[PDB]
Amino acid sequence: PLCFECGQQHWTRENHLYNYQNEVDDDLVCHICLQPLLQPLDTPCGHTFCYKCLRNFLQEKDFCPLDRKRLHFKLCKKSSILVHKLLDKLLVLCPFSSVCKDVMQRCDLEAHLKNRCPGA
Amino acid sequence: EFNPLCFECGQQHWTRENHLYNYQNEVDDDLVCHICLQPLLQPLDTPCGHTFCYKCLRNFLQEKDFCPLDRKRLHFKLCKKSSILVHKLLDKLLVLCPFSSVCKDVMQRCDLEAHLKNRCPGAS
Ligand SMILES: [Zn+2]
Ligand SMILES: [Zn+2]
Ligand SMILES: [Zn+2]
Ligand SMILES: [Zn+2]
Ligand SMILES: [Zn+2]
Ligand SMILES: [Zn+2]
Ligand SMILES: [Zn+2]
Ligand SMILES: [Zn+2]
């Protein structure tokens, strides 16, 4: 029942999971989940969180945790092209370490699993 | 005392021009301004999702009407300051002190101003 895009187990409401080769810069790491950002949203207060993390968080809380400012999900916007580019190229290891020792950009893992990986 | 060096970056430039830095390492091309071809300073985001230096874009839009990457209509007033995270990534780029004859310190870009003010033997 593994995710077909990332090769790991998770709910739809939760992020894909990755095993990153290197230590990712803290500023690309989501404050909520403490993993590198996925589908980043910018807040009006200038902070950035995962779509899924922020959607889930705003069901329970109504303030940005970094600045305590009021936060509405509908006012959050997709982060810039630049930010998405930096996140896409982050290096990950294939989760099927039993057979596969491939290392690739995060945005490329899905195609590897769907088309090429014998472990998937 | 006449036409002195910038107090904040230690290099010679006019106020309408960007600060200047000597980068220690290759900077990721995604953090480089397409207009000036240096690492972004005071990044602004366009409605088309692109990012340029505040001073480069303002100068560019004086006689131009569009985004240099995609030629979509572009107005300076519709541009916005880039996210905190983009600023934070840029701040940590390593630079060399410009006063290379007397000082060999390497530091994060955001720290150069404080270095010149509080530490450098080469500043005035
Ligand atoms: Zn997944
Ligand atoms: Zn997150
Ligand atoms: Zn905030
Ligand atoms: Zn594989
Ligand atoms: Zn300067
Ligand atoms: Zn520029
Ligand atoms: Zn554009
Ligand atoms: Zn110095």
Numbering used by the authors:
A (entry chain A): 2 to 121
B (entry chain B): -1 to 122
From the paper:
The LNX (Ligand of Numb protein-X) or PDZRN (PDZ and RING) family of proteins comprises five members, LNX1–LNX5. The domain architecture for these proteins shows the presence of a RING domain (Really Interesting New Gene) and one to four PDZ (PSD-95, DlgA, ZO-1) domains. Moreover LNX1 and LNX2 bind numb—an inhibitor of NOTCH pathway —and lead to its proteasome-dependent degradation by ubiquitination thereby enhancing NOTCH signalling.
LNX2 (20-147 aa) exists as dimer in the crystal, with two molecules in the asymmetric unit. The structure consists of a core RING domain (Asp46-Arg90) flanked by two zinc finger motifs on either side (hereafter referred to as the Zn-RING-Zn domain). The core RING domain of LNX2 adopts a typical RING fold, comprising one central α helix, two antiparallel β strands and two long loops. Collectively, these findings suggest that the N-terminal Zn finger motif is indispensable for the ubiquitination function of FL-LNX2. Notably, Lys109 of one monomer makes hydrogen-bonding contacts with Asp45 and Asp47 of the other monomer in the dimeric Zn-RING-Zn domain. We show that although LNX2 exists as a dimer in solution, this dimerization is not required for its autoubiquitination.
